Design a protein around this motif. Sequence first.
Motif, PDB file in Angstrom:
ATOM      1  N   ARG B 198      -2.942  -9.966   9.375  1.00  0.00           N
ATOM      2  CA  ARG B 198      -2.356  -9.076   8.384  1.00  0.00           C
ATOM      3  C   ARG B 198      -0.839  -8.986   8.550  1.00  0.00           C
ATOM      4  O   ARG B 198      -0.090  -9.207   7.595  1.00  0.00           O
ATOM      5  CB  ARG B 198      -3.007  -7.687   8.485  1.00  0.00           C
ATOM      6  CG  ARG B 198      -2.613  -6.717   7.318  1.00  0.00           C
ATOM      7  CD  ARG B 198      -3.435  -5.421   7.295  1.00  0.00           C
ATOM      8  NE  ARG B 198      -4.780  -5.613   6.745  1.00  0.00           N
ATOM      9  CZ  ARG B 198      -5.060  -5.646   5.439  1.00  0.00           C
ATOM     10  NH1 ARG B 198      -4.091  -5.500   4.543  1.00  0.00           N
ATOM     11  NH2 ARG B 198      -6.313  -5.813   5.018  1.00  0.00           N
ATOM     12  N   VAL B 202       2.029 -10.204   5.936  1.00  0.00           N
ATOM     13  CA  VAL B 202       2.855  -9.192   5.286  1.00  0.00           C
ATOM     14  C   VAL B 202       4.329  -9.375   5.640  1.00  0.00           C
ATOM     15  O   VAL B 202       5.206  -9.219   4.784  1.00  0.00           O
ATOM     16  CB  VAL B 202       2.346  -7.781   5.652  1.00  0.00           C
ATOM     17  CG1 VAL B 202       3.309  -6.690   5.131  1.00  0.00           C
ATOM     18  CG2 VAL B 202       0.966  -7.561   5.088  1.00  0.00           C
ATOM     19  N   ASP B 203       4.639  -9.737   6.889  1.00  0.00           N
ATOM     20  CA  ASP B 203       6.012  -9.642   7.368  1.00  0.00           C
ATOM     21  C   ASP B 203       6.699 -10.972   7.660  1.00  0.00           C
ATOM     22  O   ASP B 203       7.922 -10.978   7.864  1.00  0.00           O
ATOM     23  CB  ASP B 203       6.067  -8.768   8.633  1.00  0.00           C
ATOM     24  CG  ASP B 203       6.138  -7.290   8.312  1.00  0.00           C
ATOM     25  OD1 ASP B 203       5.973  -6.918   7.129  1.00  0.00           O
ATOM     26  OD2 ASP B 203       6.365  -6.497   9.249  1.00  0.00           O
ATOM     27  N   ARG B 324       2.267  -0.055   3.434  1.00  0.00           N
ATOM     28  CA  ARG B 324       3.175  -0.866   4.236  1.00  0.00           C
ATOM     29  C   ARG B 324       2.552  -2.205   4.629  1.00  0.00           C
ATOM     30  O   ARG B 324       3.275  -3.205   4.764  1.00  0.00           O
ATOM     31  CB  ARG B 324       3.605  -0.086   5.485  1.00  0.00           C
ATOM     32  CG  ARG B 324       4.297  -0.926   6.569  1.00  0.00           C
ATOM     33  CD  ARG B 324       5.600  -1.521   6.060  1.00  0.00           C
ATOM     34  NE  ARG B 324       6.390  -2.126   7.127  1.00  0.00           N
ATOM     35  CZ  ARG B 324       6.255  -3.390   7.517  1.00  0.00           C
ATOM     36  NH1 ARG B 324       5.356  -4.171   6.925  1.00  0.00           N
ATOM     37  NH2 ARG B 324       7.014  -3.869   8.492  1.00  0.00           N
ATOM     38  N   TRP B 325       1.222  -2.263   4.788  1.00  0.00           N
ATOM     39  CA  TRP B 325       0.555  -3.484   5.242  1.00  0.00           C
ATOM     40  C   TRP B 325      -0.441  -4.029   4.212  1.00  0.00           C
ATOM     41  O   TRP B 325      -1.397  -4.722   4.564  1.00  0.00           O
ATOM     42  CB  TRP B 325      -0.122  -3.251   6.596  1.00  0.00           C
ATOM     43  CG  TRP B 325       0.861  -2.836   7.668  1.00  0.00           C
ATOM     44  CD1 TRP B 325       1.001  -1.595   8.212  1.00  0.00           C
ATOM     45  CD2 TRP B 325       1.842  -3.664   8.306  1.00  0.00           C
ATOM     46  NE1 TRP B 325       2.009  -1.596   9.146  1.00  0.00           N
ATOM     47  CE2 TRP B 325       2.545  -2.849   9.220  1.00  0.00           C
ATOM     48  CE3 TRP B 325       2.202  -5.015   8.187  1.00  0.00           C
ATOM     49  CZ2 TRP B 325       3.583  -3.332  10.003  1.00  0.00           C
ATOM     50  CZ3 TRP B 325       3.225  -5.494   8.967  1.00  0.00           C
ATOM     51  CH2 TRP B 325       3.913  -4.652   9.865  1.00  0.00           C
ATOM     52  N   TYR B 326      -0.225  -3.720   2.934  1.00  0.00           N
ATOM     53  CA  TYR B 326      -0.970  -4.343   1.851  1.00  0.00           C
ATOM     54  C   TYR B 326      -0.543  -5.803   1.699  1.00  0.00           C
ATOM     55  O   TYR B 326       0.648  -6.125   1.735  1.00  0.00           O
ATOM     56  CB  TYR B 326      -0.725  -3.565   0.544  1.00  0.00           C
ATOM     57  CG  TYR B 326      -1.387  -4.143  -0.700  1.00  0.00           C
ATOM     58  CD1 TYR B 326      -0.764  -5.148  -1.452  1.00  0.00           C
ATOM     59  CD2 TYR B 326      -2.620  -3.671  -1.138  1.00  0.00           C
ATOM     60  CE1 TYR B 326      -1.355  -5.663  -2.594  1.00  0.00           C
ATOM     61  CE2 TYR B 326      -3.224  -4.187  -2.286  1.00  0.00           C
ATOM     62  CZ  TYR B 326      -2.584  -5.175  -3.012  1.00  0.00           C
ATOM     63  OH  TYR B 326      -3.188  -5.692  -4.153  1.00  0.00           O
ATOM     64  N   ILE B 327      -1.514  -6.699   1.532  1.00  0.00           N
ATOM     65  CA  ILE B 327      -1.229  -8.131   1.561  1.00  0.00           C
ATOM     66  C   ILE B 327      -0.941  -8.605   0.140  1.00  0.00           C
ATOM     67  O   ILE B 327      -1.851  -8.682  -0.690  1.00  0.00           O
ATOM     68  CB  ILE B 327      -2.381  -8.933   2.180  1.00  0.00           C
ATOM     69  CG1 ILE B 327      -2.630  -8.507   3.640  1.00  0.00           C
ATOM     70  CG2 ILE B 327      -2.056 -10.409   2.106  1.00  0.00           C
ATOM     71  CD1 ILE B 327      -4.035  -8.863   4.157  1.00  0.00           C
ATOM     72  N   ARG B 328       0.319  -8.945  -0.136  1.00  0.00           N
ATOM     73  CA  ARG B 328       0.685  -9.466  -1.454  1.00  0.00           C
ATOM     74  C   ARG B 328       0.317 -10.941  -1.620  1.00  0.00           C
ATOM     75  O   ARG B 328       0.006 -11.367  -2.740  1.00  0.00           O
ATOM     76  CB  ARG B 328       2.187  -9.304  -1.710  1.00  0.00           C
ATOM     77  CG  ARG B 328       2.623  -7.959  -2.297  1.00  0.00           C
ATOM     78  CD  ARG B 328       2.560  -6.890  -1.247  1.00  0.00           C
ATOM     79  NE  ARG B 328       3.334  -5.699  -1.592  1.00  0.00           N
ATOM     80  CZ  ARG B 328       3.617  -4.745  -0.712  1.00  0.00           C
ATOM     81  NH1 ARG B 328       3.196  -4.874   0.561  1.00  0.00           N
ATOM     82  NH2 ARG B 328       4.334  -3.681  -1.091  1.00  0.00           N
ATOM     83  N   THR B 351      -6.766  -3.353  -0.057  1.00  0.00           N
ATOM     84  CA  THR B 351      -5.837  -3.666   1.018  1.00  0.00           C
ATOM     85  C   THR B 351      -5.046  -4.940   0.786  1.00  0.00           C
ATOM     86  O   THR B 351      -4.140  -5.235   1.572  1.00  0.00           O
ATOM     87  CB  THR B 351      -6.573  -3.764   2.372  1.00  0.00           C
ATOM     88  OG1 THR B 351      -7.191  -5.048   2.511  1.00  0.00           O
ATOM     89  CG2 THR B 351      -7.634  -2.677   2.480  1.00  0.00           C
ATOM     90  N   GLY B 352      -5.322  -5.682  -0.276  1.00  0.00           N
ATOM     91  CA  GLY B 352      -4.526  -6.865  -0.519  1.00  0.00           C
ATOM     92  C   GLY B 352      -4.973  -7.594  -1.763  1.00  0.00           C
ATOM     93  O   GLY B 352      -5.985  -7.257  -2.388  1.00  0.00           O
TER      94      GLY B 352
END
Lengths: 388, 389
Positions: B198, B202-203, B324-328, B351-352
């Motif tokens: 995740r 995300v990052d 903040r940690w939703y998966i685009r 969540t994504g």
Amino acid sequence: LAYSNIPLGATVIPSPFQVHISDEQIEELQLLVKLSKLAPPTYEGLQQDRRYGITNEWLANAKEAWKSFDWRPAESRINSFPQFTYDIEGLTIHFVALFSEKKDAIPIVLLHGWPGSFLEFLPVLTSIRDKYSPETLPYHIVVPSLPGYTFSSGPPLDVNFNGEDTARVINKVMLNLGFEDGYVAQGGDIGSKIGRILAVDHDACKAVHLNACYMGKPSSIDITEEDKRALARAQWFATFGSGYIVEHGTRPSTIGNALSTSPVALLSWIGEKFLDWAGETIPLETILESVTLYWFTETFPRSIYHYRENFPPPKLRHTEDPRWYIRKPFGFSYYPMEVVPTPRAWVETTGNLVFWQAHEKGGHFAALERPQDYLDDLTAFCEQVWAG
Amino acid sequence: MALAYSNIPLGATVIPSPFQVHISDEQIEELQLLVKLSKLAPPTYEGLQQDRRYGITNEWLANAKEAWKSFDWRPAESRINSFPQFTYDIEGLTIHFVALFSEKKDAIPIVLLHGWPGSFLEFLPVLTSIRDKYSPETLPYHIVVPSLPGYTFSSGPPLDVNFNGEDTARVINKVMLNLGFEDGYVAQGGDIGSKIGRILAVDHDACKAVHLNACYMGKPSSIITEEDKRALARAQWFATFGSGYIVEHGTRPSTIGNALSTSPVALLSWIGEKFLDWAGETIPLETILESVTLYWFTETFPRSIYHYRENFPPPKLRHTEDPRWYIRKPFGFSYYPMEVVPTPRAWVETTGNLVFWQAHEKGGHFAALERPQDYLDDLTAFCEQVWAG
């Protein structure tokens, strides 16, 4: 042995008892202490404030001290107090006692918890017989080993066993000794739940004094700077200090098996508590004596049956349940480093609170840390409430 | 030391050091000694509960201890060393990883992320299937299976600073960057690896897509069939009766790490409970012993539990439930019914960007270990669906 004559009205005569750990048990202990391995250095193990548990350093040092720990003097000290066993419901129940020569001495039972034992109360017992002769002793003091602890056998292999069973068995110790007319109970940690159940459910128990009362703040209750530190400490214990409760309460066989493999594993689990819970620093020798006794008697896996009573979490906590409101005379002593320090206004909601004493020193192991304060409160509470 | 599938991709900016496992003779001798002389708990009511309601049974542990006396590490080691392995030095840590490298210039890179109490061993059956199906020349993927910091042959985490899930992902991302995958890779994770995967997606730009077989969450505030009822009851069993190890790992890691370093059978009690309870397909004793033996040889346990304190005090929002940690990026999920917290598609979708969903009839928490062919079919299906060149 002084203070060892059975009260005249006893219904069952107890069998005298002495601890004699075999030379082989002692040397098996040292063998496995020596065989134990230590964790590699970790970030968590290097924190001197113990925010993640015990330090590697403490454990290394404690293990080395253990290699020079001599059981025989401690065993001799234990055996200097009168001890007995009853057979109750198929269990051997061990207890330490000081019996008075006064016919109408006030019977009292002192109830240890986990990871404690009767050892917690020997400094108080020492103070008692310093202060009194058998002729001037105002009390009969009974200090039993709870089922599953040290020299007490059980709990059963084939049925569940809980705190109400524990209370039933402990009450019978006092009945066996002729105290059906009445006794006082004193409890801390798990002993405080046992004490509450004795007072609530058993006729012979006329009054109960507690130095722990595990509860959240009642909703019926409004603070001072002492009330502030009590709440912060209670929140610390609830958030960071309750891992062992959840593991004892849900997986007792797993942790029971893991920590029986090595005495140093049991030292780690138990030592953390003697360090974090105390107000007055408990000496390393006292920790080692307690862990050694648990080891010799395979206490730890037999001792954690109480914790599963909170899984799933009950609607009301025991102390907050009207089913367990203490209607008899109820006393509380406040030690600021108790794991959940509870102000008077909290405690008053769980019983008929006629006695309240607060102290500046001392924490969870009140009898062990502050034996004179403990004994003073116990004498004052018993004199205040005893009705003949 | 030539090895098939071990040619470093052409774009690599840092050449990794070849690695092979060689546990010393003295460690193997010592392990057998410590197992034999480990003391066992006496009988208790709790230890006789053969439905394991209070943890592992006395009978299971005595039997595992007996079997452990005659477990041979060396053939398991030979099997491990038949796969290419490497180390990198990244931020002063030594990061171990297994790999299968393709000869194709444009092979899809993939990173597989284990959790606790697992390791790179979980993925060896899947890697075995991959190298049976593909030669280095026909392999469509680069497969990277790293040891998280603190696990087996990966060192650390650091002695002098805290280290959390975001540091884990930063360091694992650099393994992929070192190998030349800044243009893109796919990540796959379960257990703690699903949290890392995740964070990667995300990052970190180089992670282009992510497939999970775990999505630890409560019923989302955003929002019941036969299966959904069953998934809810299992998730409720885990939170109420199954999370003792989480609280202990997250609040007192030093105490339990020290406790469980003392004796291999202490470690086995603690870890074996999870291989029994979390599996859908029964995991053989030999595999449990292999995994616990590897942890013991590498002093893994105390170094491996730093992730659990990220839940204490309980964060405002669970990672998976936090925008903040939703998966685009393209997000895939595989539902295994015996996962410790089975999450229906409606939960996961909050969540994504969920473009891939596969449900399975068999399998539990250790998906790649229990259902290697299911795990592999999903992974390749997902990668082929989302990869854009």
